[PDB]
Nucleic acid binder design. Structure first.
Ligand SMILES: [Mg+2]
Ligand SMILES: [Mg+2]
Ligand SMILES: [Mg+2]
Ligand SMILES: [Mg+2]
Ligand SMILES: [Mg+2]
Ligand SMILES: [Mg+2]
Ligand SMILES: [Mg+2]
Ligand SMILES: [Mg+2]
Lengths: 119, 252, 140
RNA sequence: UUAUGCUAUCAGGUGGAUGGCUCGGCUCAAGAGCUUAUGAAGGACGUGCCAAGCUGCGAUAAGCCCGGGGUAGGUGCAUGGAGCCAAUGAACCCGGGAUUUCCGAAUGGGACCUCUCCGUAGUGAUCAUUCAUGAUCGGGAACGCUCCGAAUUGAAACAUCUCAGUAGGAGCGGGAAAAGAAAUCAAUUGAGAUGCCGUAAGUAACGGCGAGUGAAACCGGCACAGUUCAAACCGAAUCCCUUCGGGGACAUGUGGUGUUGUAGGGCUGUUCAAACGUCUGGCGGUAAAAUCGAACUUGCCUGGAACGGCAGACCAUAGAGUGUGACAGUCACUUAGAUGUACGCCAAAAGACCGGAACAUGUCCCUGAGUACCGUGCGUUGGAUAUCGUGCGUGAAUCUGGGGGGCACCAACCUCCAAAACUAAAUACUCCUUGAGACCGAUAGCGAAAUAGUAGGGUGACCGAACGCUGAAAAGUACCCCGAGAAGGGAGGUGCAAAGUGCCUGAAACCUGAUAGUGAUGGAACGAUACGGCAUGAAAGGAUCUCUGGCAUGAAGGA
RNA sequence: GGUGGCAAUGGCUAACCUUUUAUCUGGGCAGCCGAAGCGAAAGCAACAUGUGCGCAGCCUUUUGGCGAGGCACGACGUAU
């Protein structure tokens, strides 16, 4: 959250970069599928490690898969099948920004997830 | 003189007689004076700190050492406090106690504003300011425009009046400026398209508030900057009947 | 001054660079040296030495506000239009106590019958008022 | 094969300018404004699995517990190995607690000893008291009040003056403080507390009448507020503590009445009725994290990477922005707008509490003392014989009274009641909070884009830097060869691009090599002009342009 | 000084109110300057052209006429 109380770019970037962990939970959000937003009452939500998502921008457009990892600090999500191959040859997973992905399937292992999407 | 009243369909449905403010002469110089005065009056003081480069205790070494005579630190040779030493005070920097504001007398400022208002009727200057439109000036509208509460209705009215082209030009010519303006909060460089002047505070103020490059104001808050931004008269202004009826002695 | 004009001229319109140093290139600070080396400038600008006269206290001294009979005669109709005076029997009855003026001086001519009442009239103002058929009355 | 060299260009090294970016700085505005013996701020030392600096915390030691928000990851600046914590809801933010070593107001004694001695276990000093208990001590960016108090400098010297009641010092102190309800200002008749703002005004006034210094009243505004004691008369009618038994203060006066000027109050009588104020109350506002909040991520093209070009579809009380692998209203955070909100803050209705205002009355009573005033000295002031302060000396009167009305005294007239006391708001400042900017953009802006008052310097008071940038993603160079080698080099690969670990672009100075010209007979401001040799002349320069001739007209001149 | 506004029935407003957050619109007649000067002060108080010449300009038998501003007198206020 960064309001129009302040419109300066430096203030907004400082509020984003020094934002606490409870404000960085909202950084992980992404556009849902059309079906999910139609059946959940909100236009988007936050992506958790495990739910199937599809990267709709970048080198891995349309590659659905499972979010293997997420860091709240850097705001980076790593997708199964969206990786990089190093000089060693081992497949190191790639971090993609959560805005780049679009959620297709949810992950309802958390009973609190229903109240996290809305209200 | 007189104009026509155009309803929400865009067609002219009645002849309106313009007030005596509209038949004023064209004065680019007084328009420029009012514009520069308002832009100075909106300014803000700045300047360095009270002792920038000056809180040092440095003293010169005198002669006999082969170096220059500038002030240097008491325990090292590094120069300080002079405007040409590194880290030294800015010789002649801006002061926060400066008074950048200008002044125009109320009679000549009102004459400048009336000159700007007369310029809105003139098709040559309005089309000579980059405004792209096919309506016939002046664009006076019936007072139903005050009480429309959604920007789609504003879009329909501007399309009907032949003024949506300039709104589109404002939206899609709105372009990033160059230099240090972006970092200090001025990223985009904007355009002026449409000026709506309702008779009183109505929901059209919230309606066309989000139109790209479109300013809406009551007749009371009709400074000359709105009527002629950047010292150039010829803003594509949209009035109403209420603004016309509240304008007989606006600036005299 | 014009800073951008002298970028390159070194001295910036000052002649020698030994000019424009401090108070010595002006002959002291303020209006100093008015008896020794700025005597003629003191004469030219009014700084010349001396005291002359006295002052009465401002609480007792008073500067009256004046108006000439020509001004009253040639805009008395503007007084009757404005409401500061009226016309009785063809004689413009004008009181000075409400217009703020307290003395009347006979500069100019009088034509119409002005019934002027004021604090004090000059002798020629009285003469010019009474020649025209009007009258002067001292008002307390 | 001309070395040492010279000049111009090119490649590379050293280097870190320019350009671009920036979580920092500065300035202005708006809010809010004290904390500390219930042990602060500040400091020393400790504190992490591998932890050196900074930051946080204190032997429960980068933490512990509880209520609220948030919910899927967390384990600081600083995404390393191995573990740990978390769906018994952590991390994180708001609120309330716990722990909180030593010093420090530091306070049981003591400090060249941040520790040490006595332990009889700590209330050190000064104070109030019923000797139960309580107050003061230190810090706070500036502001506020009181007192003390220079010189440079200006006068073109310099002493009165100015600089200037400035700089500095001592005491006190809060969110504001001081001021404050006329012994006032006026002028012939008026106004009606104070502060601050504008103006009066560079005027009056002061002054080697030099330089300079320099108000107030009237008036227009911000904001509006009036009262309490001493005393007359009454006389313990009271006030504080408490174990509710009682104790203490007080007749050297607790308390009631009373509080002022065309005089007021008391005593005598009469008439009306009771204003403002104190307390209870919390209807309603305000109020913590925080909640919701529109509509594209559609086709082709280039691209590593689309926010872009060409087409296409929508939102706009919401086109302010920021991030996102490039220009984003429609991807995320958001934004206009609606919400929730404990403790606290304000708070009107509805009630209880004491009562206030006039009338007539008079040989009656009270109404602030080393005070008002005066002489003299000094400082200060614009204050001039006419500012205020206070050192010494003097020193009244009591309503049939006293003061003022810019030298004094007399008279008239006008105006007020001192020497006792309180009093919001308007105002001032910025540690802190938020916003904004024709501000700076890294040698600038704070000194510090903060492992910055740090490294470092000084015995000490104190002085005081430099250091920003990989890439979209580490994909941070596998394997092989040389090398003694975890150095380094080649080959090779990741990367659109080495941008190849202070790594973006990567200037010049300086250094190394190559190319062109010249060069071991040669004269110097390194160049200007003209003519030639050598090399280049792809782009951006010419194509009736370049070279060589004939013909026509040919000014000045003229064989 | 250059450019402008308003202009003897003059000009400007300052603080401040209005801010829908520093803009701006409408107010704000206190006050400053001009309007009468001379004089230390008390105090007194003037020309709304009486006259001559004459540029631009207009008219004109092209030499003259009228002539704003300009120049030179006359008259008047006050101090000595
Ligand atoms: Mg600096
Ligand atoms: Mg000279
Ligand atoms: Mg001097
Ligand atoms: Mg204290
Ligand atoms: Mg007081
Ligand atoms: Mg002084
Ligand atoms: Mg928006
Ligand atoms: Mg710096």
């Amino acid at each position: 959250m960064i309001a129009m109380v302040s419109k300066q770019p430096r203030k907004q970037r400082k509020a984003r970069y020094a934002a606490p962990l409870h404000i960085r939970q909202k950084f992980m959000g992404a556009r849902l599928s059309e079906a999910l937003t139609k059946e959940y009452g909100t236009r988007s939500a936050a992506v958790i490690t495990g739910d199937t998502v599809k990267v709709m921008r970048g080198d891995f457009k349309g590659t659905e898969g499972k979010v293997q990892s997420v860091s709240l600090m850097d705001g980076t999500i790593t997708v199964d099948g969206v990786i990089s191959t190093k000089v060693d040859g081992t497949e190191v997973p790639r971090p993609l920004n959560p805005s780049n992905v679009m959620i297709t399937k949810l992950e309802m292992k958390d009973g609190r997830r229903a109240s996290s999407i809305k209200k | 003189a007189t104009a026509k009243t155009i309803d929400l369909t865009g067609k002219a449905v009645g002849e309106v007689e313009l007030p005596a403010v509209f038949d004023a002469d064209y004065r680019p110089d007084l328009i420029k004076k009012a514009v520069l005065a308002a832009q100075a009056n909106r300014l803000q003081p700045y300047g360095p700190r009270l002792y920038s480069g000056m809180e040092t205790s440095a003293r010169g070494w005198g002669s006999g050492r082969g170096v220059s005579h500038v002030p240097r630190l008491v325990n090292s040779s590094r120069a300080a406090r002079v405007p040409h030493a590194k880290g030294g005070r800015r010789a002649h920097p801006p002061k926060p106690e400066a008074d950048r504001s200008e002044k125009v007398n109320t009679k000549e400022r009102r004459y400048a504003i009336r000159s700007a208002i007369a310029a809105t009727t003139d098709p040559t200057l309005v089309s000579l300011r980059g405004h792209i439109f096919e309506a016939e000036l002046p664009i006076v509208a019936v007072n139903d425009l005050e009480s429309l509460e959604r920007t789609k209705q504003v879009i329909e009215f501007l399309e009907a009046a032949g003024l949506y082209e300039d709104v589109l030009r404002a939206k899609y010519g709105r372009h990033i400026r160059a230099g240090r303006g972006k970092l200090r909060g001025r990223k985009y460089k904007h355009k002026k398209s449409v000026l709506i002047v309702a008779g009183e505070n109505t929901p059209i103020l919230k309606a066309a508030r989000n139109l790209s490059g479109v300013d809406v104001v009551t007749v009371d808050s009709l400074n000359a900057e709105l009527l002629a931004p950047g010292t150039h008269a010829g803003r594509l202004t949209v009035w109403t009947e209420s603004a016309i009826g509240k304008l007989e002695g606006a600036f005299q | 001054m014009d800073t951008k004009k002298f970028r390159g001229s070194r001295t910036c319109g000052g002649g020698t660079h030994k000019n424009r140093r401090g108070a010595g290139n002006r002959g002291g600070r303020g209006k100093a040296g008015g008896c020794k080396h700025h005597f003629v400038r003191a004469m030219m600008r009014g700084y010349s030495y001396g005291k002359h006269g006295f002052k009465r206290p401002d609480e007792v001294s008073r500067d009256v506000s004046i108006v000439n009979v020509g001004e009253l005669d040639e805009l008395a109709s503007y007084l009757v239009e404005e409401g500061l005076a009226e016309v009785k029997d063809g004689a413009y009855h004008i009181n000075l106590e409400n217009l703020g003026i307290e003395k009347v001086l006979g500069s100019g001519r009088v034509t119409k019958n002005l019934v002027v009442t004021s604090e004090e009239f000059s002798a020629s103002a009285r003469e010019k008022i009474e020649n025209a058929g009007g009258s002067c009355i001292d008002a307390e």
